[PDB]
């Protein structure tokens, strides 16, 4: 059988059980491992945990941990009820009160590669 897909080290964070499994490498197409992110990161799906998955492209995502960013409290605006993760690229629309916004027309917040953008602070 093929084995394409070397021991997968990337930004960030790792597979669990590295040690375990670093020498059972190279692997085939279907395979999958689980992995986690450094506190600050991601997986894209948000979750605390995801899959590496060997394709006919190799490991799958490209990019596996991506920034963290988590809504909750918004200074002078609506705050939510329990931790949300959102994963760098991903936006929301914060509720501002009493004249007070982010300043950016839509009262919008990106997750970027440094955190929220702008963060959540009506003003």
């Not at 960013?69 to 009160?97: I, R």
Request: hydrophobic letters at 25%.
């Amino acid at each position: 059988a093929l084995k394409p897909c070397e021991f997968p080290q990337f930004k960030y964070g790792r597979l669990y059980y590295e040690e375990s499994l670093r020498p059972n490498f190279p692997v085939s197409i279907g395979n999958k491992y689980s992995y986690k992110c450094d506190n600050g990161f991601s997986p894209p799906s948000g979750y605390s945990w995801d899959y590496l998955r060997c394709t006919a492209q190799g490991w799958e995502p490209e990019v596996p941990c991506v920034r963290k960013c988590v809504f909750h409290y918004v200074e002078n605006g609506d705050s939510a009820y329990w931790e949300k993760v959102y994963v760098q690229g991903q936006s929301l629309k914060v509720q501002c009160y009493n004249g007070y916004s982010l300043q950016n027309g839509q009262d919008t917040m990106t997750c970027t590669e440094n955190g929220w953008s702008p963060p959540p602070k009506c003003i």
